[PDB]
Every structure is written in structure tokens, then in C-alpha cells.
Amino acid sequence: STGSATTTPIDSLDDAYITPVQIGTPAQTLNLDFDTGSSDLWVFSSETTASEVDGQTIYTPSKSTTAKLLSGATWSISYGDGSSSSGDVYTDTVSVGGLTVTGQAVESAKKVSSSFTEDSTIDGLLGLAFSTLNTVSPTQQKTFFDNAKASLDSPVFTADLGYHAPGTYNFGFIDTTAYTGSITYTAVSTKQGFWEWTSTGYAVGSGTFKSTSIDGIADTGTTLLYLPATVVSAYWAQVSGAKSSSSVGGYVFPCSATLPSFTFGVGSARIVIPGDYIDFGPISTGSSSCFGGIQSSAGIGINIFGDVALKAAFVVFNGATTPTLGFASK
């Protein structure tokens, strides 16, 4: 089997992407944030504290004839941005772009933090990291990908995120029309539960390539590109007037600038992030100070190849017995 679904930016800045997901019988369609940096499928629901729901579409398990309470199961998660959610668990039928899993753990939110409430466009998350990170207790649950894997034509999914435009998540096949040149595969460590790999270096604009190992994670659920302070300083030093602002919480730059591209290495291959991808617009409405899309990972504890990087590539998440990551230009 295979699945194919369109993923759509939630706003004009590509702050996140939502993908429609069918849950239950009859289908309840929710727009979820596909997140290769976490491993829980959780949804706004009929159980969510009413004051914490503001515009989202909710899952009502009592209206699904295939929903079954997973007795005794609870979940609780906190993300790297400080947001959180928690609740109980159902199993139900879940389909993505034509691909169907029965008995998928659907984690029903009883509580969500304010950032989730304030984002009316995201109805929940669908985790695509390794199932070892799943928070369900006392019996850890498998991700959608994990559950589908054996049935897929090939044990892979691919992320093809758009710049200010829709893109695609495919399951079970590689669309050879969706990229240019070749796919370069690189090793993955699953020891932290992430799609963790090592970039071979970087370049700023038309500058020379710096060969240096950068360990980080391929994370569709993170907006920006988070890299070591040395690398990030070298980038923003090429933008007149750019500076790190502790009051804003990162590098800002004059909205009148033309940003340079940023290249990262995948083995001997190179992915180029156009400068426009690195502009996240005014820090506040009407400001001429703009927020940068490349930020320091210092104090995160890990480097993160978020959407800014990933949307510049066609990315293969290869879930073979020995997982690997593949990157192509497009």
C-alpha cells in the first residue's frame, strides 16, 4: 500500500504545515501537524477543556463506531518550545492520503497549553519520530508510520515541504518526479529516538564550503534551522545590521536586507536554502526589524534541521531495519 497527502502552510510565514487526516468511522477529518521530532498522535477532542479550545476541529470518539477506549492509558508531552498537552487514549481507524491503519492509538487531549489553544489552524500532531519516544503510559504505543510499515510497498515516507506553497507527504514510495538529480543517503542514529544524522558542513552565500561535522535532527515539527553559535554567527555577519537580540530572543535583521543563501552538506552533496527562506518577517506588526530563520542551538542541547532547511529539499525518511535519511534538491 501507499498514501499521499498534501501538506499546507498554516500562514504566510510557513510557521508550520497541516495535513488532513481521517480518524474514525464515519471519518472525522482533522488537520494535523506532521512532526518527525515526536512520536505521539494527539488531537483536540470532545474531552478537551472547553476554555482551551478556540476554533480547532475536534475528534469526538463517541461518534466513531470503531473507537475503543484504551483502558488505563494516559499521555503527557512537553515540546522543545515549551508547549504541552495531555489526556487519555483511544484506538481507532486512521487514514492519511488513502493509507489506512486500524487500531492506531489516537491520543485525546484533556488539556493543552496556551500556544496550542491560540493556534486555531492546528487540530493536533501526528508524530513520525521513532516509537521509543511515545509518551503513552503504562503501555507505550506505536506511531502511524510504525503501524503502517509492514503494509507499505517500501518502508519509507517522504517530506516535500513547500516554500510559501503546498507540498506533499508520501508513504510507501519515492516519487522520482518530485526532485532533481540524485537522492543522497546518510546514516541515522536512533539512540535519542530522533531522525538524527550528521551534516558534512556549510557555506554562507557564495562563500567557500566549510567541512565540519554537524550532528542534528530532521524535524518537520520545528519551524526554523537551529545550528551551533559559530555557524549562525558566520551567517548573520554577512547581513548588514543583523544582530542577536536577547529581548527578541534571537537574531534579527533589517527588513530592508537581501539575505544570502545557506548551504548545508549531505555527504558529498549540497542543499541550498535560498535567502528568502530565512526571512520570517517583522518581529511585531509594522516593525522594520525582521526575525531570522537561522538561529543558535546553544542551550537547546541539539541542532535542529527544521522546516527552513527541510523545505529546500526532497527528504526520504527510510525506515528500513537500519534507518537512513535521504536528501535531494528539487
Curated annotation (Swiss-Prot):
It is an enzyme of class 3 (hydrolase). It comes from the Eukaryota. It catalyses: Hydrolysis of proteins with specificity similar to that of pepsin A, prefers hydrophobic residues at P1 and P1', but does not cleave 14-Ala-|-Leu-15 in the B chain of insulin or Z-Glu-Tyr. Clots milk. The active site is at D35, S199. Its EC number is 3.4.23.22. Keywords: Aspartyl protease, Disulfide bond, Hydrolase, Protease, Signal, Zymogen. The keyword Hydrolase applies. Transmembrane segments: none annotated. One of its GO terms (biological process) is proteolysis. Disulfide bonds join C255-C290. GO terms for molecular function: aspartic-type endopeptidase activity. Residues 17-328 form the Peptidase A1 domain. Belongs to the peptidase A1 family. This is Endothiapepsin. The lineage of its organism: Eukaryota, Fungi, Dikarya, Ascomycota, Pezizomycotina. The chain holds residues 90 to 419 of 419 of the full protein.
